[PDB]
Amino acid sequence: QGVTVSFYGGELNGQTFTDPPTVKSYARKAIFGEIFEFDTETLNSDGIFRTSPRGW
Amino acid sequence: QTLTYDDIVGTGLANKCPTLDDTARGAYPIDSSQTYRIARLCLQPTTFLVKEEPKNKRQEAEFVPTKLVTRETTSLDQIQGELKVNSDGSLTFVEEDGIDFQPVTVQMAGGERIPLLFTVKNLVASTQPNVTSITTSTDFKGEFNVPSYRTANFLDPKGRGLASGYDSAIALPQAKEEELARANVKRFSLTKGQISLNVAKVDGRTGEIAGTFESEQLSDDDMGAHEPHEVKIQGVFYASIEPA
Amino acid sequence: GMFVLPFMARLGVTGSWSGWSITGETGIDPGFWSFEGVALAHIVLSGLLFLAACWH
Amino acid sequence: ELVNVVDEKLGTAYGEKIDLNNTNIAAFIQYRGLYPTLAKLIVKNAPYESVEDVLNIPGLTERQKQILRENLEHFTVTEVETALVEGGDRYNNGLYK
Amino acid sequence: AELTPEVLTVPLNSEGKTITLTEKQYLEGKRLFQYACASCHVGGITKTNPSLDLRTETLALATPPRDNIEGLVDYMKNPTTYDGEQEIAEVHPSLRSADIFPKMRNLTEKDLVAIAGHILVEPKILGDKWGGGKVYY
Amino acid sequence: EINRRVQASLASGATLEEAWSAIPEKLAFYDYIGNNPAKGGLFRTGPMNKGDGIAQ
Ligand code: CLA
Numbered sequence: 198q199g200v201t202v203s204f205y206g207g208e209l210n211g212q213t214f215t216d217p218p219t220v221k222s223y224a225r226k227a228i229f230g231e232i233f234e235f236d237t238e239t240l241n242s243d244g245i246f247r248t249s250p251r252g253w
Numbered sequence: 254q255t256l257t258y259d260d261i262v263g264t265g266l267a268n269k270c271p272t273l274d275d276t277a278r279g280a281y282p283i284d285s286s287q288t289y290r291i292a293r294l295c296l297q298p299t300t301f302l303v304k305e306e307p308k309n310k311r312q313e314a315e316f317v318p319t320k321l322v323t324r325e326t327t328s329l330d331q332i333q334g335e336l337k338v339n340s341d342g343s344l345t346f347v348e349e350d351g352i353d354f355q356p357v358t359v360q361m362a363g364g365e366r367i368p369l370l371f372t373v374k375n376l377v378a379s380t381q382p383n384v385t386s387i388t389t390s391t392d393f394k395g396e397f398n399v400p401s402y403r404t405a406n407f408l409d410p411k412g413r414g415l416a417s418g419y420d421s422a423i424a425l426p427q428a429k430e431e432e433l434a435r436a437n438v439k440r441f442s443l444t445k446g447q448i449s450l451n452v453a454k455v456d457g458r459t460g461e462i463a464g465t466f467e468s469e470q471l472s473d474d475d476m477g478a479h480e481p482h483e484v485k486i487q488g489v490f491y492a493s494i495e496p497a
Numbered sequence: 498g499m500f501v502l503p504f505m506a507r508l509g510v511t512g513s514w515s516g517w518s519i520t521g522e523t524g525i526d527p528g529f530w531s532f533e534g535v536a537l538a539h540i541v542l543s544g545l546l547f548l549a550a551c552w553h
Numbered sequence: 554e555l556v557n558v559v560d561e562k563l564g565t566a567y568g569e570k571i572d573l574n575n576t577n578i579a580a581f582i583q584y585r586g587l588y589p590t591l592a593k594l595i596v597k598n599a600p601y602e603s604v605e606d607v608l609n610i611p612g613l614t615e616r617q618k619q620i621l622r623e624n625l626e627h628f629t630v631t632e633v634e635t636a637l638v639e640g641g642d643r644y645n646n647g648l649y650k
Numbered sequence: 651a652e653l654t655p656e657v658l659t660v661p662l663n664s665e666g667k668t669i670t671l672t673e674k675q676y677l678e679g680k681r682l683f684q685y686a687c688a689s690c691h692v693g694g695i696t697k698t699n700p701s702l703d704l705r706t707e708t709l710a711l712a713t714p715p716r717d718n719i720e721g722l723v724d725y726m727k728n729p730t731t732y733d734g735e736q737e738i739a740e741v742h743p744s745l746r747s748a749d750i751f752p753k754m755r756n757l758t759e760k761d762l763v764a765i766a767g768h769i770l771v772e773p774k775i776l777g778d779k780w781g782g783g784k785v786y787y
Numbered sequence: 788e789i790n791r792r793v794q795a796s797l798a799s800g801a802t803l804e805e806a807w808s809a810i811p812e813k814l815a816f817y818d819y820i821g822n823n824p825a826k827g828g829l830f831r832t833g834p835m836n837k838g839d840g841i842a843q
Pocket residue numbers: 501502504505508510535539
């Protein structure tokens with residue numbers, strides 16, 4: 198289907214990606230809503246969702 | 254004196270190639286004007302050797318013995334193909350079809366299991382020139398194809414595959430992908446193997462030959478997830494040669 | 498950091514049921530008196546001595 | 554860079570037409586007259602350097618050639634992909650309904 | 651929604667003639683299809699060859715065309731491969747092979763018309779379920 | 788609310804990049820499922836940052 202992704206605002210503002218692996222990677226994050234860059238190194242984060250103090 | 258399925262079933266003989274008597278030391282004449290085929294090629298492995306992976310490059314690694322754990326399911330059989338007479342008098346066997354692969358798992362000292370696709374798929378094997386008769390001095394040497402041990406639909410335990418399956422580690426929804434690329438992106442191996450067939454017995458009247466073989470090929474690479482091992486397979490073979 | 502392995506090797510126990518030896522050989526058969534067989538024998542002895550202690 | 558070669562092939566003509574060098578044989582049911590007689594001959598005599606080479610299959614009847622000519626617009630050829638043609642997958646690729 | 655005369659109106663031949671089945675014909679067609687055919691064709695698929703289904707669009711691209719009463723009735727007498735090239739009565743139930751498929755022995759011409767009408771009406775009711783397999787259950 | 792603000796920016800003549808760049812990062816961050824308290828696990832312990840990471 199020749200799917201592309203363009204970003205508006207944020208870090209990636211003004212950029213467009215067309216290679217299927219990259220476009221697919223952003224589509225996978227879009228099921229979570231808005232897309233963010235995370236530091237996963239400082240805490241050795243494992244990539245699995247946890248609840249907030251509201252939940253606990 | 255001819256055995257039935259009920260004579261054979263459960264004995265292990267079904268995984269064994271036919272043998273020839275010690276009196277079978279004859280010669281099978283080749284008519285350069287006649288066309289020939291191998292009506293049945295059988296390869297019965299007796300030893301699987303795996304080359305160790307040494308830490309020292311100055312050290313020459315050796316092939317070490319292994320324990321077969323997948324039982325009497327290892328032989329290649331009912332293989333057929335053209336036996337060409339070349340202009341220089343050499344013969345070339347061109348494999349056409351048959352039960353020409355077996356998945357095999359052998360186990361190294363310490364427990365490491367080595368799966369491989371023991372095979373002669375697409376074998377092309379040739380003798381020396383000027384083979385006017387097949388004798389106990391005739392040898393066949395050739396190459397074959399070794400496709401991926403798993404084919405393209407195979408799904409790993411987290412549901413990932415090449416022609417099917419997930420393309421990511423779905424249990425880690427927000428992990429960084431780069432470190433998982435080798436496990437996430439399945440790749441299909443296709444390499445070459447080499448084999449030698451040493452004729453040891455010939456029944457000139459029936460066109461049957463038997464002997465020993467040695468073949469070398471790579472083991473399973475788990476669809477690109479890790480490096481394969483080098484394997485050397487030794488065993489006995491049988492072939493029936495017919496005018497075609 | 499091996500502490501009891503050298504004491505088994507000192508008196509002739511050099512192989513594993515899994516096929517290796519501490520001298521680096523492959524496909525050796527140590528019989529029952531592998532490192533594992535020694536360990537098993539000591540566990541069984543322990544249990545028998547425990548039961549004897551109860552009786553006495 | 555690591556690439557899934559099947560996903561990659563979906564971005565070529567393979568994802569748009571019947572690839573005479575790669576596509577599983579059930580795809581020939583899409584068009585009148587191709588399955589199973591021509592479909593078997595096409596897969597057996599693959600691969601082809603161009604779509605028109607399918608007309609050179611030895612033994613084709615004149616009616617078979619006409620049918621192929623009417624369907625060349627639905628065919629393509631790409632490089633043989635090992636992952637699609639091993640395992641007998643052109644004859645049975647593990648998909649039923 | 652109702653099983654109307656319009657739903658029960660299906661192509662009789664390849665030349666644009668239609669035939670309007672009665673409700674009793676529709677019920678007879680369902681019964682006869684279950685009796686003789688559903689062991690392999692339940693829900694419009696084909697268990698012993700899932701590549702070929704009973705969808706109207708599939709039947710239309712068969713040779714000769716099978717998306718009408720005459721085509722389906724002929725198929726039950728003298729079935730062919732999808733390209734019309736081979737006669738397969740020896741491995742597919744038909745009147746021609748009623749000797750080896752005994753359930754065909756008592757099917758009358760009237761019965762074959764009902765079975766054909768069932769195959770054509772059922773996708774008009776069930777849509778993608780007909781020939782869809784388990785995905786659409 | 789994000790879409791409402793973007794549409795109001797476009798209607799006032801902003802470009803697409805300008806409209807999305809006007810969205811506060813804090814507002815976009817609420818529109819992400821990793822902050823949904825119904826995405827955790829009973830034994831996935833600790834701060835949300837331990838899962839998807841520290842948002843940057
Ligand atoms: C039943 C027979 C038996 C056998 C064949 C073994 C065999 C073994 N034991 Mg086990 N063990 C046993 C019973 C046995 N054990 C019992 C009953 C216990 C509980 C006390 C143990 C507790 C034990 C431990 C904690 C360890 C072993 C270990 C071992 C291995 C090394 C042995 C060694 O180096 O000893 C060395 C023995 C000596 C140096 C003997 C010293 C004797 C002193 C000097 C005698 C002095 C008094 C004497 C009366 C003086 C007069 C003598 C006279 C002749 C003049 C070897 C496989 C080692 C191992 O590898 O574990 C996996 C180890 O760490 N064993």
